[PDB]
Each structure stands twice: as structure tokens, then as C-alpha cells.
């Protein structure tokens, strides 16, 4: 395998041996992801922006520490995103998931739960859910004290005109001219620190009080209902440091 070590370690992490796992070399599993993966240089400004994003948008439970930052390009996704690439309000947002899902997530992308599934466990319907604060997303890694390494995505999400809710709707259907849902949290990143890569907003202000009174959520949530509104950009490998 010519692939860089961090990339090889990641491949190992999300496929894992044992059973029908004594088999399949690194490069074959990599090609299986239908994804280009490059290591973001630790010294890059890209890396600095991302570490600031992690550091600032994070209390109690565990301590997050970045180990590796990967730039990812899933086959065909950028071309799929073109419909929404010139739609106002695009943000770089977090998506955590458990490691065992990342093989599927990288090869198939993030997907909309099938229409037949029941509506419980979908606070804002069957969509793709993001956060503007890593701590929120990082709980969905379900990482343990025993294996305290986790994977979180950063995706460019084309939110457009948001539909702003303080409570669960449980439906996947938006009013006319709304393209996404913003779950309104108590805490929000400080807008005076938000910067703009590309024309994509990176909300890396330190968490402050949002002023929103009557609400269930500690943190904002963002939900889109069309896979073409998501363009995955980075994958972070994170050390969780517990108590
Ligand atoms: O985004 C979600 C999702 C995530 C969650 C949990 C969650 N997980 N991760 C987060 O970063 C996050 C942030 C804010 C709010 C919720 C989350 C709940 C309901 C959901 F439908 N997906 C459902 C599971 N996904 C799939 O691709 C499966 C195949 C259908 C990815 C898309």
C-alpha cells in the first residue's frame, strides 16, 4: 500500500478484522469507499481553521483533541451539489456518527431514512441532521472510555431559507420556499467570530447564549431533506479524553 499511514489507519479503523475480516487488503477497501482521501497538513490554515472550530464550539463529559484531519471528495457528490451550490446560506457543519457507519457513509454518502420507518427518533423528520457545535455532534459517535477515538464529518450544507422551530415537528415536509430546518438551541456560536471560507460560513465563534426563551434544545440543529444539499468536505479523527 502506497497510501499515507494516517489514511491506512483510518481504513483499518472503519473496516476492522475478525470473521470475514481475516482478508481484504488496505487498497481494495479504500477503493471500496469511492472517495478520495488526503491528509490535511497539520500546519495548514485549513487545519488551523478546523482546530479553532473544534476548540471553540465545545462544560463537562470529555475533552476533544484532533489527531488527524482528512479532506474527502466522494465520487460524484460535488457534481450532485451543483443544483444548490449558488443557493444563499451555506455552512460548514458537524455530523457525528459511530465508526461502524463510516464505510457506508463514505461509499453511499449521508442518506434519508426510508419513508416506511416510524417517526420516533426523528425529532425533525427523516432528513440529514447537522450541528454548529462539535460537542453536540460528538455524542453521536458513542465512543467509550475503552476505545476513545471517534470520527466526525464536516459537510458543506446548503440550507437556503431555514424554517426555525423551537420544538420537534416530526415531519419531513416544509412550507413553500423553505429548504431546511433550524432547531433553535439555547447556545449558539458567537456570530461576531464567524468567518467565511469560499462563500461558506464557518461558525467557529465561542458558544454564547442565543437569547431564545422557550426551547427544548441546548444546541442548534440543522436539517435538510435532500441529499443534494450536502457536500462532505472533511473527516476528523478525534481523541476523547474522559474522566
Ligand atoms: O442525519 C441523520 C440523523 C441523525 C440523527 C442524530 C445525529 N447524529 N449526528 C449529528 O451530528 C447530529 C446533530 C444534530 C442532531 C442530530 C444528530 C438523528 C436523526 C437522523 F436522521 N441521518 C440518519 C442516518 N443516516 C443514514 O445515512 C442512514 C441510512 C439512512 C444519515 C442521516
From Swiss-Prot:
<feature type="binding site">
    <location>
        <begin position="95"/>
        <end position="97"/>
    </location>
    <ligand>
        <name>NAD(+)</name>
    </ligand>
</feature>
<protein>
    <recommendedName>
        <fullName>Poly [ADP-ribose] polymerase 1, processed C-terminus</fullName>
    </recommendedName>
</protein>
<feature type="domain" description="PARP catalytic">
    <location>
        <begin position="24"/>
        <end position="243"/>
    </location>
</feature>
<feature type="active site" description="For poly [ADP-ribose] polymerase activity">
    <location>
        <position position="221"/>
    </location>
</feature>
<feature type="binding site">
    <location>
        <position position="104"/>
    </location>
    <ligand>
        <name>NAD(+)</name>
    </ligand>
</feature>
<feature type="binding site">
    <location>
        <position position="111"/>
    </location>
    <ligand>
        <name>NAD(+)</name>
    </ligand>
</feature>
<comment type="subunit">
    <text>Interacts (when auto-poly-ADP-ribosylated) with AIFM1.</text>
</comment>
<feature type="binding site">
    <location>
        <position position="137"/>
    </location>
    <ligand>
        <name>NAD(+)</name>
    </ligand>
</feature>
<comment type="function">
    <text>Promotes AIFM1-mediated apoptosis. This form, which translocates into the cytoplasm following cleavage by caspase-3 (CASP3) and caspase-7 (CASP7) in response to apoptosis, is auto-poly-ADP-ribosylated and serves as a poly-ADP-ribose carrier to induce AIFM1-mediated apoptosis.</text>
</comment>
Amino acid at each position: 500500500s502506497k497510501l499515507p499511514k494516517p489514511v491506512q489507519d483510518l481504513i483499518k479503523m472503519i473496516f476492522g478484522s475478525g470473521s470475514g475480516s481475516g482478508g481484504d487488503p488496505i487498497d481494495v477497501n479504500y477503493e471500496k469507499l469511492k472517495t478520495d482521501i488526503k491528509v490535511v497538513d497539520r500546519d495548514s490554515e485549513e487545519a488551523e481553521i478546523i482546530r479553532k472550530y473544534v476548540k471553540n464550539t465545545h462544560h463537562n463529559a470529555y475533552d476533544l483533541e484532533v489527531i488527524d484531519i482528512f479532506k474527502i471528495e466522494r465520487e460524484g457528490e460535488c457534481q450532485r451539489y451543483k443544483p444548490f451550490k449558488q443557493l444563499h446560506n451555506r455552512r460548514l457543519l458537524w455530523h457525528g456518527s459511530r465508526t461502524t457507519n463510516f464505510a457506508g457513509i463514505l461509499s453511499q454518502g449521508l442518506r434519508i431514512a426510508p419513508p416506511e420507518a416510524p417517526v420516533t427518533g426523528y425529532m425533525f423528520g427523516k432528513g440529514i441532521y447537522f450541528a454548529d457545535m462539535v460537542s453536540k455532534s460528538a455524542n453521536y459517535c458513542h465512543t467509550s472510555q475503552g476505545d476513545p477515538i471517534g470520527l466526525i464529518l464536516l459537510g458543506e450544507v446548503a440550507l437556503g431559507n431555514m424554517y426555525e422551530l423551537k420544538h420537534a415537528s416530526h415531519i419531513s415536509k416544509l412550507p413553500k420556499g423553505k429548504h431546511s430546518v433550524k432547531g433553535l438551541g439555547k447556545t449558539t456560536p458567537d456570530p461576531s467570530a464567524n468567518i467565511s471560507l469560499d462563500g461558506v460560513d464557518v461558525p467557529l465563534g465561542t458558544g454564547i447564549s442565543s437569547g431564545v426563551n422557550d426551547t427544548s434544545l441546548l444546541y442548534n440543529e440543522y436539517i435538510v431533506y435532500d441529499i443534494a444539499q450536502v457536500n462532505l468536505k472533511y473527516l476528523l479523527k478525534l481523541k476523547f479524553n474522559f474522566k
